[PDB]
Amino acid sequence: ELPIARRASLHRFLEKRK
Amino acid sequence: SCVATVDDVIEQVMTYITDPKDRDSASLVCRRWFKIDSETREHVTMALCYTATPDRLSRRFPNLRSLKLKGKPRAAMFNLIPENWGGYVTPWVTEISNNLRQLKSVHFRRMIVSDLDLDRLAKARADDLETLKLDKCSGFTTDGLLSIVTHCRKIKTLLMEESSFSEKDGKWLHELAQHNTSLEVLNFYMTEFAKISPKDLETIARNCRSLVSVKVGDFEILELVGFFKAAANLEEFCGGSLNEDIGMPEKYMNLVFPRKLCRLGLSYMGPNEMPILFPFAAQIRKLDLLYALLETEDHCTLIQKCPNLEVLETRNVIGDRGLEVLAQYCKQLKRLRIERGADEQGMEDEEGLVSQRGLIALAQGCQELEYMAVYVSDITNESLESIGTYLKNLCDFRLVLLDREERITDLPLDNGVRSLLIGCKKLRRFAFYLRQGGLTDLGLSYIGQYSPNVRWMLLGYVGESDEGLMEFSRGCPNLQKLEMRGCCFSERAIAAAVTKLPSLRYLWVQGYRASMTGQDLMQMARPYWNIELIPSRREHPAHILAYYSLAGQRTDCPTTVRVLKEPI
Amino acid sequence: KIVLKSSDGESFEVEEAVALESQTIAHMVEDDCVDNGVPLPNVTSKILAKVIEYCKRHVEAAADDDLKAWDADFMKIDQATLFELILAANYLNIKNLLDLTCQTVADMIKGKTPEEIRTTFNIKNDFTPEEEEEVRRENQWAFE
Numbered sequence: 183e184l185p186i187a188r189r190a191s192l193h194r195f196l197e198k199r200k
Numbered sequence: 201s202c203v204a205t206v207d208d209v210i211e212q213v214m215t216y217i218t219d220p221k222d223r224d225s226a227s228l229v230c231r232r233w234f235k236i237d238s239e240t241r242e243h244v245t246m247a248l249c250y251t252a253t254p255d256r257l258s259r260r261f262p263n264l265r266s267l268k269l270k271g272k273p274r275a276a277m278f279n280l281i282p283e284n285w286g287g288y289v290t291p292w293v294t295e296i297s298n299n300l301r302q303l304k305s306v307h308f309r310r311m312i313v314s315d316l317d318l319d320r321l322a323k324a325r326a327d328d329l330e331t332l333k334l335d336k337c338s339g340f341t342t343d344g345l346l347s348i349v350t351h352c353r354k355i356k357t358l359l360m361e362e363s364s365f366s367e368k369d370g371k372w373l374h375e376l377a378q379h380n381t382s383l384e385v386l387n388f389y390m391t392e393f394a395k396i397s398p399k400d401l402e403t404i405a406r407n408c409r410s411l412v413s414v415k416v417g418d419f420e421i422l423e424l425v426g427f428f429k430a431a432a433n434l435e436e437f438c439g440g441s442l443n444e445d446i447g448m449p450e451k452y453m454n455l456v457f458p459r460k461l462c463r464l465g466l467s468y469m470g471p472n473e474m475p476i477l478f479p480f481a482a483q484i485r486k487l488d489l490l491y492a493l494l495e496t497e498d499h500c501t502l503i504q505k506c507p508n509l510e511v512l513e514t515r516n517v518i519g520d521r522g523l524e525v526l527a528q529y530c531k532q533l534k535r536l537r538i539e540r541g542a543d544e545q546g547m548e549d550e551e552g553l554v555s556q557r558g559l560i561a562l563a564q565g566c567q568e569l570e571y572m573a574v575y576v577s578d579i580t581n582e583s584l585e586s587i588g589t590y591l592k593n594l595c596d597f598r599l600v601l602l603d604r605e606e607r608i609t610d611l612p613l614d615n616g617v618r619s620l621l622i623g624c625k626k627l628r629r630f631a632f633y634l635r636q637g638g639l640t641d642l643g644l645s646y647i648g649q650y651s652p653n654v655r656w657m658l659l660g661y662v663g664e665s666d667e668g669l670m671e672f673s674r675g676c677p678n679l680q681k682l683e684m685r686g687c688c689f690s691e692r693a694i695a696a697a698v699t700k701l702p703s704l705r706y707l708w709v710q711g712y713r714a715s716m717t718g719q720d721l722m723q724m725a726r727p728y729w730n731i732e733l734i735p736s737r738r739e740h741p742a743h744i745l746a747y748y749s750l751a752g753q754r755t756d757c758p759t760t761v762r763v764l765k766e767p768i
Numbered sequence: 769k770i771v772l773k774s775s776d777g778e779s780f781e782v783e784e785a786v787a788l789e790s791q792t793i794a795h796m797v798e799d800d801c802v803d804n805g806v807p808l809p810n811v812t813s814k815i816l817a818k819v820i821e822y823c824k825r826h827v828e829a830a831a832d833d834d835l836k837a838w839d840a841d842f843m844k845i846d847q848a849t850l851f852e853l854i855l856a857a858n859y860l861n862i863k864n865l866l867d868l869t870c871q872t873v874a875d876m877i878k879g880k881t882p883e884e885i886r887t888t889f890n891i892k893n894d895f896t897p898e899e900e901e902e903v904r905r906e907n908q909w910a911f912e
């Protein structure tokens with residue numbers, strides 16, 4: 183089950199978003 | 201007066217050869233030419249610091265003016281590589297301190313940089329250090345920063361983008377404000393700074409007449425008005441924070457943006473604040489809506505206003521509809537990146553999917569495209585054909601298809617990949633990340649067969665059996681770096697394919713049929729070939745990382761990382 | 769008008785501003801040896817001729833498209849001559865001209881392989897095989 187790994191800069195942002 | 205030879209004139213001519221691939225050749229025509237190249241080479245880049253000793257570098261190129269080292273694998277940018285993996289920069293700075301006494305610019309990329317080792321750099325190189333790029337590095341603090349801004353009084357470009365450090369204070373920025381003049385580009389774009397004063401930023405803009413680019417953290421834009429007025433020659437700005445409260449419907453309608461500003465991206469920018477760009481959209485040539493809070497409709501309305509846009513970076517929210525707008529308003533587009541947005545609560549809207557539709561639309565409109573990276577929610581062989589059909593000077597093409605969708609129209613892409621690879625013959629980097637049924641061994645070999653120019657590949661879920669990987673391996677004349685994850689190939693299959701590849705010097709893999717033995721990997725043991733086995737940080741299957749190195753196996757391995765060495 | 773005496777006794781009548789392209793002949797109208805004409809015995813007369821021709825045309829930029837034109841066509845000469853020109857521009861001090869001769873030689877290299885190079889220059893490869901291998905290894909595995 184290999185999940186699409188999120189580019190870290192966007193991971194950080196997508197959290198700040200919510 | 202005897203007949204004049206080349207040997208009477210080469211020391212002079214050599215300094216007119218700028219191309220790194222021609223210096224490469226020139227260094228090899230004979231011992232004299234080699235020595236001349238050695239003493240005149242100004243810039244070198246190591247794609248993997250562990251590839252050679254810092255001694256070897258300084259011995260070969262004593263008079264470097266610029267250096268660039270990369271450390272952690274690319275996978276590290278995806279929280280796939282352990283933090284302690286390595287990439288320590290210190291040996292390199294004690295070497296710079298001692299033997300590269302000509303160095304005026306240093307760029308570290310994906311490396312570990314300590315306060316000490318940059319205090320050392322700062323003192324060793326001081327006023328001479330014109331540029332310093334801490335690119336996606338870790339392991340230092342503001343003390344480090346403070347050390348380089350006080351001792352390197354003439355810094356022209358200083359960069360920390362996406363680096364992570366410990367913020368103890370703001371004196372570093374203030375020390376820049378109070379004494380620096382030469383600043384041309386300042387960049388802390390993806391960084392949590394909570395202790396620096398916008399005032400200092402403004403006072404810097406006031407004092408550095410040649411200030412062209414500045415990217416920044418989560419500053420409140422309004423706090424930067426002082427800045428913007430003062431930053432006359434500013435051409436690029438990214439960063440900041442647009443925070444709307446309801447109490448002010450026109451919070452930001454009185455923004456002085458510097459007159460020359462033409463490359464930009466305001467963070468968190470919503471549809472309400474989006475209009476502050478219209479006054480000069482004609483002039484915008486680069487757009488970074490990567491961290492923007494606007495929806496598919498809002499994209500179209502803005503894109504439509506920027507006919508001279510040549511670079512655009514956005515999330516998949518742009519949508520097919522957005523891509524269609526881009527298609528005929530921005531013909532001069534050269535680079536497009538569509539990172540993937542919040543794939544949790546629906547997309548970010550119901551048009552926030554990119555597909556065959558958008559791609560084939562784009563392929564027809566923006567034919568000047570040279571870089572295209574896209575996370576798509578659905579493809580068709582047809583679309584790839586149109587790619588390879590219309591946009592010829594594509595150099596870098598990356599495609600990744602999300603697992604969100606259950607059924608994908610027509611799946612095996614064997615014939616699409618092929619026409620693409622055949623149409624874009626300028627292609628040097630190519631990434632193709634699919635789902636299992638995505639590509640059959642026949643197609644995979646099509647990739648090996650039709651990519652003569654590709655030096656780097658990232659391959660997704662290609663193939664069906666090791667048959668494919670082997671077929672692939674008989675191609676790829678110029679493949680240098682190969683990254684594959686989520687593949688069904690076996691250890692001996694990989695090891696075999698590595699042996700067959702002429703140009704390969706770097707291999708990273710996650711996910712493969714292992715064996716407790718471990719010993720199947722071994723059948724790629726060459727001299728100078730280092731192989732490493734890894735875990736994962738920020739269920740994560742084993743990684744394989746192998747690369748050529750004149751240096752031998754690294755001393756600085758973590759505990760999580762194992763170095764394979766013949767029979768154990 | 770100034771007089772330039774070539775490396776085989778050969779007076780050359782040239783205009784004021786034409787001879788001043790050479791910062792060597794410029795820095796020589798101070799301690800003006802110009803009384804007996806500027807002596808420069810390290811330039812073949814055949815060559816000095818070609819040099820003046822270049823400066824002549826470039827000074828007539830008082831009145832850009834058609835220059836890279838004449839320039840390209842000016843450079844259609846043999847190697848041996850090309851080199852003698854670089855040497856000459858360096859002996860005088862014509863920055864615009866070195867940037868052309870050197871760049872012309874550099875263009876001959878740009879694209880060729882090490883063999884193709886020492887072929888089209890007749891250079892004996894004196895690399896021990898270990899040396900060549902190390903250099904090649906450094907070049908393709910570590911640096912660049």
Ligand SMILES: CC/C=C\C[C@@H]1C(=O)CC[C@@H]1CC(=O)N[C@H](C(=O)O)[C@@H](C)CC
Nearest residue numbers: 186187275278573574575598599600685
């Ligand atoms: C082994 C780890 C490295 C990569 C795996 C990551 C995934 O899980 C999906 C792809 C991503 C890597 C990556 O670099 N993809 C391209 C890029 O960012 O430029 C695409 C974003 C181009 C459209």
